[PDB]
Design a protein around this nucleic acid. Structure first.
Lengths: 83, 129, 95, 130, 150
RNA sequence: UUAAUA
RNA sequence: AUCGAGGACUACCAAGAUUAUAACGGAUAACGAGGAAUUGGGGUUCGACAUCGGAGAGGGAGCUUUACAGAUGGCUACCAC
RNA sequence: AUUGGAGGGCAAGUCUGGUGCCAGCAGCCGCGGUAAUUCCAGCUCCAAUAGUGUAUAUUAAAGUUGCUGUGAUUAAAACGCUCGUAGUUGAAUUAAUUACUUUGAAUAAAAUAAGGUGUUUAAAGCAAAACAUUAUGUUAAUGAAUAUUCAAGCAUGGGACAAUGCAUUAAAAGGAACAAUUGGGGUGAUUCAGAAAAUAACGGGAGAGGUGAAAAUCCAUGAUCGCUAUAAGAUGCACGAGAGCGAAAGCAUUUCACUCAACUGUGUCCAUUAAUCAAGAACGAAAGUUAGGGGAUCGAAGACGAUCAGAUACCGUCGUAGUCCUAACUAUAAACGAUGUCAACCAAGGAUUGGAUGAAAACCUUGUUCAGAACUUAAAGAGAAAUCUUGAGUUUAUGGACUUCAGGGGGAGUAUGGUCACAAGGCUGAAACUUAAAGGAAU
């Protein structure tokens, strides 16, 4: 670009827009989360971009469907980000 | 494929200065790339540089100040005998007072002036005006 | 040398295209290189539309049109005045 | 092959590419000893047998006087110019002459129709001083 | 770019800048090893074994927990397959294409891609022999691979 | 429709 | 056998040796080197001939004397003179 | 004091007498057809000078043989494309040899460079003297340190960059796996369409084709035309695009299988497995060949009719091989982007194809980002220019890796030799001789 920004201190917004690899220090866009079951109270921890059917550990209200890039959680499944 | 990382770095730096850019980024960092920059700093051709660690042979950001006309690497690093110095400078450098070669020797990576002082030859890396 | 950047064709990401027949010469030209024009006309000329409408056996029958796509080789497009030879700097205009 | 250990191909490429030099190949292949009436010799001697006159090229007009010579070393038959003005009258028949080249021009040179050799002696001294 | 076609994609994974296990992870190496150990006995490739742990057990990187890679873990337990996983899957595709080619003799694109696949096999087999993974007596043959791959 | 050469 | 190593030669045994990093062949108007001519650097071409090494005495071959020769301003035989 | 010259290259005469496209000069361009700056002479001066012209060859010029150092879109020149061995080149990373580098050892002179020395200078020689007025004395005088010097061999200090050695990470290197897709990618079967033409039946009753005008031809055995029925061959309109897929050639009715490839997504695996590649190997339009089937349309050859001075052609009618399928050959194209493959950096945009990800309720409108075929602007970079900008840019400030090809135009992709093919032909492939131009972009 003709106009140039600092290459050591990129903004929070600028790094978020960039590709997951083309950042200053590459970081994954994925995360680990747990899903409370609709059927029971147990929380099953799983990858954000899981590539298989996600079942509860108790039963199996299947909690997610793998769809080419991110888990398709059911509309009644609530999750939080595991930090 | 990336055969010479130093060649990629010096082409990035030369391209940045022709466009007048303030700072440039080099993706693969090496010991040899760092040594070449240190030689260029001692002659005050680049202000400074910083090295970020990406756990994957991290990146280098170099600050340029309107002084580096051209830094280029030299393909296969010829074994430069001490008697072949002035033959190389007469070919690669603009005059007898302006530029400096870069050589890798057993005493480290040094330019032609102090390698002559230390009385040691070695493979030639590159140059800069 | 190269009078045109696209070589007079419309083929970019392929190696071969099927042939079509010139509507006037019968020549074989590739589908992209052919000069394609579309025609939509009534089956009755502007003079005779009044005559047909006068003595008709139908209430308000609307006259149909004819639709056909005509493809011309370069030689028969220039000769038939379908396209003209343009200026060197006016060749680039694609509108 | 610009590498440090790539000296085999670099040396072998110049061997092959040097054979495309028209001026260099001609001086190396075996043709100067078979297809050259003069040979390596700068000058050659022969016997005059016929006095000839060759018409010049289209943009010129006139007759180029010359002689037909039978060389001693080989036995070939050639044609030789007779330098400056009126030097053909000085050349007799069945006598030894010294034949010596010309420049080389576009191969042929100065009597136009294919002649490439000029008589420098008539037994005597010179088809100069003569 | 790719080895055999002019395609050029950069679809990669991005390891985070944290070589240690995350704070919220509590399972020790004993559970990780045995859970991985049970999966190996079921006939699962090492690449798929790690994915199952990541998706189900939340152990996304095994080297961050146990300090050693999956293949090193499997070798210590002796459950590493004799034929390396990447080479095994390549010979599984060469067999499958060849079987289709027996009935469809006129398929000229399958013959080309079978040639590319077998060239890959000879590249991997040569490398693994220099790495001493495969004994020098190993050799890929069409008449033989149908049985071992099966 | 036909129109060769210097 | 030789002054002596050695397929240098003999007897028996085995199937080995060289090759795309160019073997085996073909050409040279080819004796090799120190060197010579011309060259900004790199190079290109030449070197029968001062000096060092090799080979030859019209063509091969075989020998004598002797410390040293397969000698030829030594010998024997054949070919051409 | 001679040799060569006085149009240009190239310093020197637009002086005078003859010669009249003749004689001739002329290395190249060229001058000479009667007023020659170039011929033959006279005078003058131009260069060098005891030397000066000519002829052949070496070197420089030649960055027209390239390591330093060339060119390949259009001037000559990127294999049709992919796979592939030798060869070449190979990411970052660690506080026994070889290679590299520094010093030497040892190594014939002459020669080269270079130290001293008034052979009267100089080329030479390695001697002579400088002064001691020299026998005495410097003096037991000089010998250039005389240095080289490449490719090997020996020793020594260093281990940065490298090769063979024998345990780091997880490359916007590569490969594998999985999830969701994309694909006129390929193969097989199935299946739809009606144009053209053929046949059957019926109506009609004199023309129809074809052309610039006609003619040859078809028709009263009922043609052209109209409707309805059939059975094969071939084809796959409109949708169809500077859109998609494929290594290239190439790929278009819809269904079902069998495959394959790629993109995207990934806290999945391996850990350098990579790039380019002589020899070698798959695929390779159309035409052509061999043997079956099919044979509708068109149609090299051929036969007619026109046109023309002629017409073996263009125009019209008929029509064999062929065009179509199966099996096997052939291996060539303006096989083109006339632009090799891989990799890095790189000015402003708008749009599009396939994903991922937010917002706005599959389809569509927007933000970001990855991959693909392209397009527009440039006072900038490059180039001989046209033009190139997802390079033909980062190149006299010349070097990222590898392979192929070119050396003025012809002769000529010809002859011969070798090899492949049933054949046509394909791959490799000169020389003699000839010639000052041939050629590229622009006004």
């Amino acid at each position: 670009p003709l106009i140039e920004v600092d290459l050591l201190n990129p903004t929070a917004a600028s790094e978020a827009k960039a590709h997951k690899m083309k950042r200053l220090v590459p970081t994954p866009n994925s995360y680990f989360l747990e899903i409370k079951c609709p059927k029971c109270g147990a929380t099953t921890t799983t990858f954000s971009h899981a590539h298989r059917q996600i079942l509860c550990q108790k039963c199996g209200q299947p909690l997610g469907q793998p769809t080419g890039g991110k888990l398709k959680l059911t509309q009644q499944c609530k999750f939080r980000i595991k930090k | 494929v990336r055969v010479n990382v130093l060649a990629d770095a010096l082409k990035s730096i030369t391209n940045a200065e022709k466009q007048g850019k303030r700072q440039v980024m080099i993706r693969p960092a090496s010991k040899v790339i760092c040594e070449f920059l240190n030689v260029m700093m001692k002659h005050q051709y680049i202000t400074d540089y910083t090295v970020v660690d990406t756990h994957r042979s991290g990146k280098i950001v170099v600050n340029l100040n309107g002084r580096l006309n051209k830094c280029a690497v030299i393909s296969p690093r010829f074994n430069v005998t001490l008697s072949e110095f002035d033959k190389w400078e007469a070919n690669l450098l603009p005059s007898r007072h302006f530029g400096a070669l870069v050589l890798t020797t057993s005493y480290g990576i040094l330019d032609n002036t102090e390698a002559r002082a230390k009385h040691t030859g070695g493979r030639i890396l590159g140059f800069f005006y | 040398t190269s009078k045109r950047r696209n070589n007079g064709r419309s083929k970019k990401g392929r190696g071969h295209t099927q042939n079509v027949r010139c509507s006037h010469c019968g020549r074989c030209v590739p589908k992209d290189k052919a000069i394609k024009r579309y025609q939509i006309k009534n089956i009755v000329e502007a003079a005779a539309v009044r005559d047909i409408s006068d003595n008709s056996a139908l209430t308000k029958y609307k006259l149909p049109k004819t639709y056909m796509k005509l493809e011309y080789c370069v030689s028969c497009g220039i000769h038939g005045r379908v396209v003209r030879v343009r200026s060197r700097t006016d060749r680039r205009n694609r509108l | 092959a610009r590498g440090l250990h790539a000296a085999r191909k670099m040396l072998a490429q110049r061997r092959a590419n040097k054979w495309a030099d028209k001026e260099w190949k001609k001086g190396k292949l075996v043709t100067r000893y078979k297809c050259n009436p003069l040979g390596t010799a700068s000058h050659a001697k022969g016997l005059v047998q016929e006095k000839l006159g060759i018409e010049t090229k289209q943009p010129n007009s006139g007759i180029r006087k010359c002689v037909r010579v039978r060389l001693l070393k080989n036995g070939k038959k050639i044609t030789a110019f007779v330098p400056r003005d009126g030097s053909l009258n000085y050349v007799n028949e069945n006598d030894e002459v010294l034949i010596s080249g010309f420049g080389r021009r576009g191969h042929a040179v100065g009597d136009i129709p294919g002649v490439r050799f000029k008589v420098v002696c008539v037994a005597g001294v010179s088809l100069w001083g003569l | 770019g790719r080895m055999y076609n002019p395609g050029r994609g950069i679809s990669r994974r991005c390891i985070p800048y944290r070589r240690s296990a995350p704070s919220w992870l509590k399972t020790s190496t004993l559970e990780v090893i045995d859970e991985m150990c049970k999966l190996a006995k079921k006939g699962i490739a090492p690449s798929q074994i790690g994915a199952i742990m990541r998706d189900t057990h939340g152990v996304g990187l095994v080297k961050s927990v146990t300090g050693s890679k999956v293949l090193r873990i499997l070798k210590l337990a002796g459950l590493a397959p004799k034929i390396p996983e990447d080479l095994y899957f390549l010979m599984k595709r060469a067999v499958s294409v060849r079987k289709h080619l027996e009935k469809n003799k006129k398929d000229k694109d399958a013959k080309y891609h079978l040639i590319l696949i077998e060239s890959k096999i000879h590249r991997l087999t040569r490398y693994y022999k220099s790495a001493k993974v495969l004994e020098a007596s190993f050799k890929y043959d069409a008449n033989t691979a149908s049985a071992i791959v099966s």
